[PDB]
Amino acid sequence: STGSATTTPIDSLDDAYITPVQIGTPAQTLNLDFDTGSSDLWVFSSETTASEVDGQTIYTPSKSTTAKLLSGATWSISYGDGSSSSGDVYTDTVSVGGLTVTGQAVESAKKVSSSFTEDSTIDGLLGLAFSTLNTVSPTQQKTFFDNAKASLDSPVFTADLGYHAPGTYNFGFIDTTAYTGSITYTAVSTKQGFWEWTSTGYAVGSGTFKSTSIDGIADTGTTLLYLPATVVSAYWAQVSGAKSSSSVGGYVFPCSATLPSFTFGVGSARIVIPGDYIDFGPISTGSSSCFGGIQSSAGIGINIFGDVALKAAFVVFNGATTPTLGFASK
């Protein structure tokens, strides 16, 4: 089997991407944030505290003939940006782009933090990291990908995120028309539950490539690119007037600037992030100070290849017995 679904930015800055997911019988379609940095499939639901729902589409298990309470199971998750959610668990039929999993754990939110409530466009998350991170207790549950894996033509999914445009998540096949040149594969460590890999270095604009190992995670659920302070300083030093602002919470730059590209290494291959991808616009409406798309990972504890990086590539998440990650230009 295979699946193929279009993923669409939630706003003009590509802050996140939503992908339609069919849950239950008859189908209830929710727009979920596919997150390769977590492993819970959770939704706004009929159980969500009413004051914490503001425009989201909810899953109502009582209207699904295939929903079954997973008795005794609860979940609770906190994300790197400080947001959180928790609740109980149903099993139900879940389909993505024509690919169907029966008995998928659908985690129903009883509570969500303010950032989720305030984002009317995201109806929940669909985790695509390793199932060892799943938060369901007392019986840990598998991700949608893990459940689908054995039925897939090939044990892979791919992320092809657009810049200010829709893209695609595919399951079970590699679309050889969706990228240019070849795919370069690189080793993955699952020790922390993430799609964790080591970039071979970076360049800033037309500058020389610096060979240096940068361990980090491929995370579709993080907006920006978070790298070591040394790397990030070298980037922003090439933008006149750029500075790190503790009041704003990272590097800002004059909105009048033309940003240089940023290149990262994947083995001997190179992925180029155009300068425009690094512009996250005014810090507040009407401001001439703009927020940078490359930020320091210092104090996160991990480097994160988020959407800024991933949308510059066609990315293969290979879930074979020995997982790997592949990157191609496009």
UniProtKB/Swiss-Prot annotation:
Gene Ontology biological process terms in this record: proteolysis
Every Peptidase A1 domain range: 17-328
Record keyword Disulfide bond present: yes
Catalytic activity: Hydrolysis of proteins with specificity similar to that of pepsin A, prefers hydrophobic residues at P1 and P1', but does not cleave 14-Ala-|-Leu-15 in the B chain of insulin or Z-Glu-Tyr. Clots milk
Active site: 35, 199
A molecular-function term among this protein's GO annotations: aspartic-type endopeptidase activity
Keyword line: Aspartyl protease, Disulfide bond, Hydrolase, Protease, Signal, Zymogen
Cystine crosslinks: 255-290
E.C. numbers: 3.4.23.22
Family recorded in the similarity comment: Belongs to the peptidase A1 family.
Protein name: Endothiapepsin
